[PDB]
Write an enzyme that holds these catalytic residues in place. Sequence first.
Site, PDB file in Angstrom:
ATOM      1  NE  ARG A 143      24.131   0.202  23.818  1.00 51.75           N
ATOM      2  CZ  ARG A 143      22.976  -0.434  24.001  1.00 51.75           C
ATOM      3  NH1 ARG A 143      21.830   0.215  23.903  1.00 51.75           N
ATOM      4  NH2 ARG A 143      22.971  -1.727  24.280  1.00 51.75           N
TER       5      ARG A 143
ATOM      6  NE  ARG B 176       8.108  -7.995  21.312  1.00 50.86           N
ATOM      7  CZ  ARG B 176       9.241  -8.320  21.938  1.00 50.86           C
ATOM      8  NH1 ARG B 176       9.555  -9.586  22.177  1.00 50.86           N
ATOM      9  NH2 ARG B 176      10.061  -7.360  22.327  1.00 50.86           N
TER      10      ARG B 176
ATOM     11  CE  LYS C 274       8.465  -2.813  24.544  1.00 51.38           C
ATOM     12  NZ  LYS C 274       9.935  -2.765  24.357  1.00 51.38           N
TER      13      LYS C 274
ATOM     14  CB  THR D 187       8.845  -8.521  30.375  1.00 53.72           C
ATOM     15  OG1 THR D 187       8.555  -7.772  29.196  1.00 53.72           O
ATOM     16  CG2 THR D 187      10.346  -8.647  30.519  1.00 53.72           C
TER      17      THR D 187
END
Lengths: 514, 514, 514
Positions: free
Chosen positions: A103, A56, A253, A311
Site C-alpha cells: 500500500r 459470497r 485464489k 470476475t
Amino acid sequence: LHAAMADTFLEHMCRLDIDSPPITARNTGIICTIGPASRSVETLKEMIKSGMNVARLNFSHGTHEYHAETIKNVRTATESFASDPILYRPVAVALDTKGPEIRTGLIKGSGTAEVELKKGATLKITLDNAYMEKCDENILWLDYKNICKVVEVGSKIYVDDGLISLQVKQKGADFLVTEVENGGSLGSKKGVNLPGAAVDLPAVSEKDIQDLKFGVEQDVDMVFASFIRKASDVHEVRKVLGEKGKNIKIISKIENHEGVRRFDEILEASDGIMVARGDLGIEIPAEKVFLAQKMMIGRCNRAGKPVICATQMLESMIKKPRPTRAEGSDVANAVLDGADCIMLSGETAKGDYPLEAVRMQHLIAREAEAAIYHLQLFEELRRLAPITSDPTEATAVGAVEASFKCCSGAIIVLTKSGRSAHQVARYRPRAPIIAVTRNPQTARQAHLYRGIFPVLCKDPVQEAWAEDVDLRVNFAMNVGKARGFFKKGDVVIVLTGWRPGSGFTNTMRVVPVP
Amino acid sequence: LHAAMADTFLEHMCRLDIDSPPITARNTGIICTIGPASRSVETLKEMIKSGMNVARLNFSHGTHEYHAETIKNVRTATESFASDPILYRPVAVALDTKGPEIRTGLIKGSGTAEVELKKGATLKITLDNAYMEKCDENILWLDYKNICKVVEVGSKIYVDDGLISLQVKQKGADFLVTEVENGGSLGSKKGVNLPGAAVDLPAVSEKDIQDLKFGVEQDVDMVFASFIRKASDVHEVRKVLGEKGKNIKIISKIENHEGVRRFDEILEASDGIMVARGDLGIEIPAEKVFLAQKMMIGRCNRAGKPVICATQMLESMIKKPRPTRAEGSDVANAVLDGADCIMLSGETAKGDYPLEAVRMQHLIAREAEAAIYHLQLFEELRRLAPITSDPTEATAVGAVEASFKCCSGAIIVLTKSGRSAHQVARYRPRAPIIAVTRNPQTARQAHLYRGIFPVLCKDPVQEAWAEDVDLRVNFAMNVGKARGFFKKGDVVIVLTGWRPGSGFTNTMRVVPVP
Amino acid sequence: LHAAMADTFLEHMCRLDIDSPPITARNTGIICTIGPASRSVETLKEMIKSGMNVARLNFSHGTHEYHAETIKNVRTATESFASDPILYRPVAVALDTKGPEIRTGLIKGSGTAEVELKKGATLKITLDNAYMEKCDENILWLDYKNICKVVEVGSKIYVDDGLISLQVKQKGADFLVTEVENGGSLGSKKGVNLPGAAVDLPAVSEKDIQDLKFGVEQDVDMVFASFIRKASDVHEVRKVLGEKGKNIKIISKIENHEGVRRFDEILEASDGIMVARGDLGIEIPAEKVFLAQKMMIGRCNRAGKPVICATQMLESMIKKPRPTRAEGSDVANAVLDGADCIMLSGETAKGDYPLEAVRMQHLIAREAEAAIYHLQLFEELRRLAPITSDPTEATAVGAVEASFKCCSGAIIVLTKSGRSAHQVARYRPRAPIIAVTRNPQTARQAHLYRGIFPVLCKDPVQEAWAEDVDLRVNFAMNVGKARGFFKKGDVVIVLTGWRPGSGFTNTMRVVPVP
Ligand SMILES: O=P(O)(O)OC[C@H]1O[C@](O)(COP(=O)(O)O)[C@@H](O)[C@@H]1O
Ligand SMILES: O=P(O)(O)OC[C@H]1O[C@](O)(COP(=O)(O)O)[C@@H](O)[C@@H]1O
Ligand SMILES: O=P(O)(O)OC[C@H]1O[C@](O)(COP(=O)(O)O)[C@@H](O)[C@@H]1O
Ligand SMILES: NS(=O)(=O)c1cccc2c(O)cccc12
Ligand SMILES: NS(=O)(=O)c1cccc2c(O)cccc12
Ligand SMILES: NS(=O)(=O)c1cccc2c(O)cccc12
C-alpha cells in the site's frame, strides 16, 4: 431415443441447432456476492428463487457486526422455503478473506490529494516511516518493508491497479529508484502489484486471522483464500481454521504470476481452485489471461477438483438490464471448458439489476451445458484415469457410462460425506446428479462440484436399514419430478452402498421412475 | 525442434504455458469501422501501423459525398507507406449496405416525443398513412405494409431494439391488435424486429441500389450485404453489382431467425459470411446467440469460406483504455473456433481510444492463435475433405502437411486470382502464408481468409518467365525477414505453377531462406 | 473419385468387398530360396516372370563352387530380359550364413544309429572328446564346451529341434546331469537348442568368415546374418565384410530368446530384421511365436527399417499344388501387419511346384494390400514421427499426403543411394513408388522396402542436367504405363532434387501422365 452424436468436434459444432430446447436441469452453480443491493431478506428470497447457491461475503470492507447481519439474512431467506421439504434449495455461505497487500501512504499529508506522474519522471521509493503522510511526486512510501530483497532491476511495479507502471533502475537498500512508464493521477492508500516476482508477505495477515477465526464461529461452508503463492500458504489457512473447522473447504485464489507458475502443488493442497481473472490481469498481461484460465480449468478437470471462475463476467449489467454479446459468450465459454461454477461480483453487490444478472447467468449456462461434446470428453477422461481396486470409483464410472446409453434423466446417489457424488461428477455425466444426504453441511458444499444438485432429507431414521435407503431414494424421485428432471415411466440410475457407513457405495441399479 | 504436442484435447489444454512467447505473425485480420474518431489521415496512418487491414464504411448514416472523403482518406494513408515496397501493407475497403427496415412513425406529431407503454396495455397497429404524424399509445403506424400476411397470432414484435416487446392477439387485415409484454418510453422512427418470422421486404431497398451502384464506381473490395434471408437475396445483390463489379466479394450478414434457419443455401451463394451478433441477439434470445455463432463458424470452416465475426467485441473500450476480462476472452474465443477476421464497431468509429482498441485486438488474437490445437484440427479437416483429381488441391494439402513436419516459418505461394492461397488457408497451417501477387485487388481481398498475409509486387515483368518466378519468390523472403517471420538458414515451403496463367499450381519445393 | 473410407476399424473391416478388384501393383517383395527344384536357367527365367525379386542362397549345405554356379544362373536369367529396358525387372541375391551351432556326436560309434530316450531317464552330458564316437543313452557329447557356465539348473535343453527336451538337475563342471522330459529316437550330429539362455558362442563361426568373405567377392546385395544375440554380433559381421563390401545390407535373423529380449539395440545396429519363425518356435513356446512376430514388425515399422518375414509360410505347397486355408491367411496376415517382404523356403527349393508357390504368394499379397486401413495407419505414423528440419523428410511426408488426396496412381522418385525412396516407403503410401536409379546396386536392395518398385536407367547421361532429370522421369512414366499402374490423363506425384548429388530432394510436383 436421441440420435447418435457427431463423429468429430468439427462435425459436432456444425450440427448445433438453436431450435432444440435444453434439459430443465442446470449443471453449473451460481455464486452471488452480497452487498448493499442484495442484503435485504426480500431480495435474497427472490434471488434464491432465480438460482443462487453460494452467497459470497466479501471480507475486504465492513465490520464483523455488519457481516453477521448479512449471514443472519442469507439464512433467514434460505430457511423461509424449508416448510415444503421437497422444494427447499440449500444455500452455501463463503468468506472471501481480504489477503496480503502492499500500500501507498498519504500523499502531500492530505486525506485525498492528487499527484501527476509523467512518462519518464524519476522516483525514489523509501521504506522509512518518515515520508508517509508527506509522500510526494519524487518520494513514495511502500507498506512492504522487505521489497528490496525481492524486486530486482527491470522488474516493474504496478500502482493503483496498473494505472501507473514504473521500471526499477537501481536498488541500493532502504530505497529503489525507478523511471515511470505509464502516466496519470495518483492518490493515497492505493494498492501495489509487482509482476513476475516472489513476494515474501505472510500467508495470513493479522486481520485475516481474526476473519477466518470469525468464520469458524459463524459456521461458513467454505473459505475463499486470497493471494496464494506456495502450497505452504494453503497449509497455513488449514492450520488457523483448526480442528473446530476442519470440514470447511479451502478454495485458493490464484492471483499473481508465482501462483500460476507453481499451480500444480497448490492444487494438491486445496479443496478447489478459484481463477480470479480480476487481479490476475494486472499481475500478468491482459492478452495472456485467457490462457491461464484455460490451463487451470484444464488441470482441475484432470485432478477431479472443482474450479470456480470469477470476475467481470457480466460487468455491463451493473448499469443496463441486458448484457453485451461479449458478456454472454464468456459465461457460455467458461461453462464449455468446464468451469464448475461461476461468480457475479459488482453485478449482484452494487448494481441496479441483481435479480436480472442472476436470471441471465441461469439461462446462459443452461444452453451452454447442452453444447458440450460429451461423447469425446467422457472418452478422454476415462483414458486419463488410474486403474485402481476401489469399489466406489468403479461403481461411479459404470454409473456414468450406463447413463449415456439409456439417456437417463438423473443419477440418484445416497451420500453422507459427499464423496460418492463427487466421483460421479468427476466424469461430467449429461444427466443431473441428485444427491441425497442427511448431513445438512454436506448438502451446502455440494454446490461446488459441477452436476450435483443436492437435496436435504429431514424424514427421521427408520428402524430397518434397507427401508431407510428406500425412503431416501423415493424422496429423490419426488424431488426430480416436482422439478421436472423426469416424468413417470422415465429411467434413472441409483447408486447405493451395501452396509451403512461411509465409503461402501458399490451397487448401481437402473430403475423406472414410479 | 518443437516437442510433440499432446495426445488429447484435455492433455493439450493442461499444457498451455503463459511464459511461452508467440510467433511474430498474426493470422486473423482486423476490420475497423471508420467514423468521426478515425477519418483523419493522421489517425488512419497510425491505425494501419497498429494492424488494420479492412476499413469498413457504414452506409447507414452520412451522404455519398461524406463517404467519398473517407475513402479518399483511407487511400491517402494506405498509399503513404507505398514508397518502401517491402514494408507496404495493402488495405481493403468495404461497404456496409443499410439493408431493409420496418419503422415507427412520428409520435404525437412531434419530432422527438415520449409515450409510456405499460406491461399489459393493448395496442392496435394500423398500416393506414393517416395515423403516422399522429401516432399515440393506442395506435401505432408500421412502415411495413405487408405485415398481416407474415405475422401470425402469438408472434411477438420487438420495438426499439427489443426495449418494448408486444404479443399479437388478433389479426383482422389492415390492423393487428396486441398486448404489450415489456415496458418503457417509445420515440419516433424506431426500428421494428418481428422474431421467428419470414419477412417479405425487398432484398435490396431503393437506397441500397444507389449505394451498391456507388461502391462499384468507387472501386470497393467487398460489400457487406445486410439482412439476408434466402439464397435469392444474395443473388439479387450479385445482379445489381453487374459485370462492371463482378469481382467485388459479397459477404452476407446473417441477422434474423430465418437467415440462420436457411444458413446452408446462403453459404453456397456468398463469398463469405458475417455473423452479426448485434442484430442477431434481438431477433433471437441472447442466451442462444453463442450457439448460432459456433454453428456458423463451424459450417464455414468445413465449406472452406471465410467467416468475419462482429459486434460488441471490445465494447467497454469506447470509454476506458483497457478492456474487461469478458471482452478479452471473447475475442480470444472467436479466434479459437476459427473466426477468419474480427470486427471493431463503436470502439474505432466513435470511442476515445481507437488506436488502443486496435492494438488490443492485435495482441489478443496473436496469443490465441498459439493455443489452437492443430494436430487434431488439421487431422479432422482432412477426413472431411473430398478426394478429387485437381492438382492445385493436392499440392495445397501436401504443402500444409510438410509445413507441420519441418516446423516451417512460412509458405510463400505465387497467386494471381488468389485461389492458390485460398486453398492453403482452408487447412489452417500454423505458419503464416505470404502470397505474392501483381493484381493489386487480389491483394486487398486476401485479408478475408485466415492465415494469408498478402504482399503486392511492383517490380516490372522480366523476359524469361522462370526468372520472373524467381524474382517474386525472393521478394517474399525479403518481406518475411524484414517482418520477422523467419531468419537466414530457416526453412520455407514455396508453392508455384508449371506454366504461367491461372490454375496450374502443382509444384511444392522446400527451401532454406537465403 | 474413390469414396471416403470408414471412420473406425470395425466399420472398415465390415465394408471389405470381395467383388472389388485390386490395383495391378504389388507392394511386398518375394524372396525365393534357390535349391535343386529351381537352379535351372529355364525355371529361374520363369520364376522371375511370376514375381521373384530376391534369390536367397542357403549357405548351410553345398560347397563354394556349387553356389557360384547358382549365382551365375540367377544372373543369366535376370540378364535375359535386359534387352527391353522398360520391362527389365532387377533381382537381388542374398546369402544366408549358416551361423553358430551346438551339435551331438556320433551315436554308438556308427554313422547313422538310433537310441531310445524314455520319459524320466537320467543323462550325463560330458564335454570330454573321448565320449564322442562312443555316445550312448547314458552319456552324450556336446560340441559346445562352455555350456556349464551358461546353463543353470532348471534350464531345459532341446535336442533334434525339440523332439527331445531334457531338464538340468545338477551341474558340477565338465558334466551336467539331466532328467529327460520328451521321448523318441535320437541320431548322430543333431542340433541342440537351450531355451531362455545367453549362449557365448562366437558371432561369426570359422566357416562363416570364409562365406561372408566369399559373398563380397561374388558381389551379393545383402547378407542374412544368422543367430544374432547382441548389437556386438551385428557389429562383428559389419567388420568382416570390410570396406570392400561396406554397401552390402546386413539383415539380422532373430532366432533365440535373448535375440527377442534385446531386440531394440539389434535393430539400431542392422539395416533390417528377419523374423525367422522356424527356429524361433523351438527356442520359445510355439503358442507365443505369433506375439514375437507382431511385436517385431511393429517396432520395425516405427523405426522405419524393413522386416522380412519367413518360414513355413506355404509349407503344404511342397506336396500339393494349392495351399491350405491356414497357409493362405498367414501370408495375408503378415502382409497386413506390415511385413515388408516374405519368404518361401522348402516350397521353392525342394517342392514339386516352385512356380505355383510364387504365383500364389503374388495373388495373396496383392489382395491383402488392398485391405490395409490406411487412413488410420498413416495418421498414426505421423504422430509417431520426430519434427526435424531435414528437407528430404518434409518432402516425402508431403508427397505421401498428396498421394492420398488425389488418389495418385504412382510416386516417381529419382534416387541415387535409395534414401529418397526409403523415406517415402516409411509411410506406407497406397500408390506404388517407382524409383529411378542409375546405380545398378541401389536398384537391387530396393526390394527390401515395402512399396518401392525400382527401375534401372541405362540411357546415357545428357549434357544439361535439368534435361537429364526430364529424361529419367519420362522413363518412369513409360514403365508405369507398360505395367499398368496408370494410363494417359491419370495423375502422378514426382519427387526430385534442386541440384545434382545425393540428399537434396526438396521438390514435389503433381503431374498428369503424358
Ligand atoms: O459418499 P459417502 O460418504 O461414501 O456415503 C456413502 C454411503 O451412503 C450409503 O448409501 C447410505 O448409508 P447411510 O444410512 O449410512 O447414509 C451407504 O450405504 C454408503 O456407504
Ligand atoms: O492462385 P491462381 O490464380 O491459380 O494463380 C496461380 C498461378 O501463379 C503462378 O505460379 C505464377 O504465374 P503468373 O506469372 O502467371 O502469375 C502460375 O504458375 C500459377 O498457375
Ligand atoms: O535418394 P538420394 O540418394 O538422396 O538421391 C537424391 C538425388 O537424386 C536427384 O534427384 C537426381 O540427381 P542425380 O543426377 O545426381 O541422380 C538429385 O537431384 C537428388 O539429390
Ligand atoms: N467445450 S468442449 O465440450 O469441446 C470440451 C470441454 C472440455 C474438455 C474437452 C475434451 O477433453 C475433449 C473435447 C471437448 C472438450
Ligand atoms: N479451438 S480448437 O483449437 O480446440 C478447435 C477449433 C476449431 C476446430 C477444432 C476441431 O475440429 C478439433 C479440435 C479442436 C478445434
Ligand atoms: N492391418 S491394419 O491395416 O489394420 C494395420 C497394420 C499396421 C498398423 C496399423 C495401425 O497402426 C493402425 C491401424 C491399422 C494398422
